[PDB]
Amino acid sequence: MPSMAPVLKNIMPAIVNVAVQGYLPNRKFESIGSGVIIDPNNGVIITNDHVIRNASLITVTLQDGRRLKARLIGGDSETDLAVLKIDAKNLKSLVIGDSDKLEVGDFVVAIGNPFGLSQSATFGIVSALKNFIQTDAAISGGALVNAKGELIGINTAILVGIGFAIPINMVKDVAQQIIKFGSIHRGLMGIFVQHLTPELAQAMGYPEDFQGALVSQVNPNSPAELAGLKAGDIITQINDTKITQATQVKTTISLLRVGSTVKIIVERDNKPLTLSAVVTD
Amino acid sequence: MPSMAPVLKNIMPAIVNVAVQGYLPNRKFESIGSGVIIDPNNGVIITNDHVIRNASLITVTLQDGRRLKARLIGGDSETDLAVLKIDAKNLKSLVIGDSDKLEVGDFVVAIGNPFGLSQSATFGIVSALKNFIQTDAAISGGALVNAKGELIGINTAILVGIGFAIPINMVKDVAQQIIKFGSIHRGLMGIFVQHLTPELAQAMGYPEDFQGALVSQVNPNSPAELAGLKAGDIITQINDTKITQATQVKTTISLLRVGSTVKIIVERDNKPLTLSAVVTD
Amino acid sequence: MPSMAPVLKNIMPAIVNVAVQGYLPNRKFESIGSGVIIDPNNGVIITNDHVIRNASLITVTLQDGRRLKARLIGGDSETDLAVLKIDAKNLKSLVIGDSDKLEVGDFVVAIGNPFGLSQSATFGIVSALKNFIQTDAAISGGALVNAKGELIGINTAILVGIGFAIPINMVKDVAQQIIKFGSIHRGLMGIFVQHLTPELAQAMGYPEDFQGALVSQVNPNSPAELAGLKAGDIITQINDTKITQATQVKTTISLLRVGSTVKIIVERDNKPLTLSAVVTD
Known part of the structure; x- marks a missing residue:
């Protein structure tokens, strides 16, 4: 008589209810969902982007009952994900x-x-x-x-x-x-980019005055990794556009059709590099 | 290649179709559902409350085909349950x-x-x-x-x-x-009550003139069992109210908020007893 | 940790996407469904009747990608089935x-x-x-x-x-x-009938001038097989009606109520035969 209870028992502590006492921007509401704790030490909860949308208040009922105060670490409508932290003890994870x-x-x-x-x-x-x-x-x-x-x-x-x-x-x-x-x-071809802060810039033996987008992580088999692109690169220049903004890569890219051969000047180990790359529908 | 047929075979005799040639109270209808035989000896069928609602006629097709006459033993809208008896032979149960x-x-x-x-x-x-x-x-x-x-x-x-x-x-x-x-x-705190009929009253060595509600069954861990309350008790008096009616307990209780400390005078083994009890939201 | 992937892997080559560039009879459309290859040699695909309804164009994307030209072999709205052939190589079946x-x-x-x-x-x-x-x-x-x-x-x-x-x-x-x-x-009682073509007629040592419906296949336990009826029979005469058309059996039958005792004159091994038969609701 197989059953799923046996594993379910195990993995239900790490499930949390989530209430969002929010107002609706220029009427109250209370959006409510569920969430999951992925790091029990730093007490990290994940949940939906749309639940914490317009959140004035953010409260997390534990499974053992502990109603709690949460903190919006961050969001991602691009994948409806959303990251929260709850400051707390004796937290279990599966x-x-x-x-x-x-x-x-x-x-x-x-x-x-x-x-x-x-x-x-x-x-x-x-x-x-x-x-x-x-x-x-x-x-x-x-x-x-x-x-x-x-x-x-x-x-x-x-x-x-x-x-x-x-x-x-x-x-x-x-x-x-x-x-x-x-x-x-x-951004481009399954890569993740961030802003090159001065603090990062110099941290990597570069100058503070220096600029680009910071290739934070290139996902394997991405046309980027194919294009020769790795994490820790600093896209200095997609094609004619001087990339000194992190969200340029995107707006830059979005305005270029598929089957088009693109030139990313990356800055790696203190030397420029063109990279033969390609967009795809 | 696991499958559920093997057990399904076994448990399908004891399933019955149920037709309710009823009129609709001051237009005909025919409400139809399914039902299940829990006692094959006394030929007891269970079904939905709403199916036999307004039933003038009550007919039970067996699985082997025997169309039959059923009898409404009783109902329970409170849990949409409903009890019927069909007078019959060679009846199988699982x-x-x-x-x-x-x-x-x-x-x-x-x-x-x-x-x-x-x-x-x-x-x-x-x-x-x-x-x-x-x-x-x-x-x-x-x-x-x-x-x-x-x-x-x-x-x-x-x-x-x-x-x-x-x-x-x-x-x-x-x-x-x-x-x-x-x-x-x-009624109260997971208990079942019935009318203290004379016939019951005296059957339990009491008088016929005697009155109360008859605690018929107290469900375990109920605040009643917690309150000290057992089956065969006769609630003589919830608080100020003389309980001599069985449905009083309910109307009595319903009109009292949660977190309120209630006094049930029960009559057990021919002696009164107050019981410290508590209502819960 | 049982799972269905293991078998699914195996049986997904033989699944095809199906696009029907059709017009809508006296406006374009593109009805699209899925289909399955049952014979890999003759490259036979099966699909829904309603997908290829009004098909001007009929194209079959393989699972490995090979977009292809299909041919409507035939249909069956009576069971929404529809038979197609695609002329092609290296075709896998499960x-x-x-x-x-x-x-x-x-x-x-x-x-x-x-x-x-x-x-x-x-x-x-x-x-x-x-x-x-x-x-x-x-x-x-x-x-x-x-x-x-x-x-x-x-x-x-x-x-x-x-x-x-x-x-x-x-x-x-x-x-x-x-x-x-x-x-x-x-047609009648789980049998399949076809037109007795001259070519069939004579092929079975009969004359070309000869006529009837050709009992193509009698499904077991059908009242027909019960009625004594087999494949290769030639229904010459249901009751008063001279059956010389294949779809007569149907129109003939349809206009007769259930519990009615019918006389099929079949022609088997060059001799007539009445058959006691019966219609059923």
Whole structure:
């Protein structure tokens, strides 16, 4: 008589209810969702972008009951993710798997905490892997877990029998990014860029006066890594455009069609480099 | 290649289709549902309250085909349950489990008989245990069964991916209650009360002239059992109110807020007793 | 940690996307579905009737990517099935099971290819076997497969939690029929009839001038097989009606109520035969 309770038991402490006493910008509301703690030490919670939208107040009911004060570390509408910290003790966490293992047909359960007093679970499979995960489990900002009961995704209800989650890998990338900066910008060919602060600039033996976008992380098999591009590079110049702003790469790129051969001047180990690169529909 | 057919085979005889040739009170209708036989000897069927609502006629198609005459033993809108008896032979029944075992994540199948000629089955898990069972199996008055294929719930469609059932324990409580009386009233802190008939009154060595509500059954861990209250007690007096009516306890109680310290004079073994008790939101 | 990926891997080559550049009869459209290859040698694809409805163009994206030209071999609105051929090489196919094995409760996965670039999978069980298969897997013209990952059905979305498929047996019957003729007519008591062409007529040692409907295949336990009727018979005469047209059997039959004792003069091995037969509601 197989059952999913055995693993569910294990992975439900690390689920939190989330209430957002917010006003609606120039009428009150109370948006409420669920969330998940990925670091128990630094007490990091993840949740939906849209839940903490317009948040004046941010409160996290633990599973053991501890109603709490949360802090918006950061957001990512680009993937509806959102990072929070709660200052607290005796916090339990359960395992994170690796999305890269996800086959379709793999069994999952979507878990949440819609009412703070409690739990909630649905069942289906990985339906499709489009960067969405698709699933026939019913739907948010909660855990998605595999048949081993490992945290492999985070749930995001949007616009039926079609659940939708975000891989925990992609979700770790934005989080850890958002933690380390007012972060997560995303740009060309699966790369993550940040602002080259003076403090960074010089930290890397460069000058404070020096400028570019800072390639923070290049995701493998990205046309960027293909283009020869790595983390710690400083895009000085996409084509004719002097890149001295981090969000230029994007606005710059967006205004160029697919099948177009682009020249990124990166600045690595104190020397310029053109990089043969290519845009893709 | 695991499958649920093996147990389903076993537990489908005990499923019945139910047609209700009723009129609609001062236009005909024919409400139709499914039902389940819990006692094969006394030929007891359970079903939904709303199906037999306005029933002039009550007919039960067996699984083997025997269209039959049923009798409304009793109802319970309070939990949409409803108890019927069919006078008949060679009746088969399958196992009843224990709801108290139900973990969330546990696999279930919801079964029915919407067309009398036949069968119907859905799949999901125990989602939440609020006194509702929640489930992602699609939806009534039919069996819900565990992965061992045991009868653990009864289905009740109300007002999406959210099935809803009633635990077989709770369902046995009301049934066996309804059988033994024109029964099931429910009242304070998970207790069941009935009318102290003369016949009961004296049966318990009391007088016929004697009055109170008869505590018929106190459910464990109820604030009542906590309050010191047991089955066979006769609530003579909640607070200032002389309880000589069985439904007083309720109307009496309902008109008192939560966190309020209440005095039930019970009459046990021929002596009065105050009981320190407490209401709860 | 059981999972369905292992079998899904195996059975996804044989899934095709299907685009129908059609006009709408006296405005363009592009109806698009999924389909499945049942014969890899003759390159036979099956799909929905309604997808290729009004098809001016018929194109089949393979799973490996090969966009292709298809040909409408034939249709069957009577069961929404439709048969196509694509002229092509290196084509892979996965196993076909036998619907007759299908118990309710049996696990299935519904698979498709709604976007040609890709895959898509849902999960449920065989709910009911009415000649429809009912299922709680979400929904077309795609594979339905058992827990052994065998092709046991084909999907057909019509007019909620109620998927609907057509058994692969029934689906092989119409296909192989449609292949061998401008075929599939269906008629009395689970029999399949075709036009007695001269070429057939004489092929069976008969005359070219000779006429009747050709009983092409009598399905077992059909009242026809019960009526004494077999494949290769030539219904010369249902009752008073001279059957010399193949679709007469139908129009003939349809205009006769249930519980009526019918006389089919068949012509077998060059001799007439009345057959005692019976219609059924």
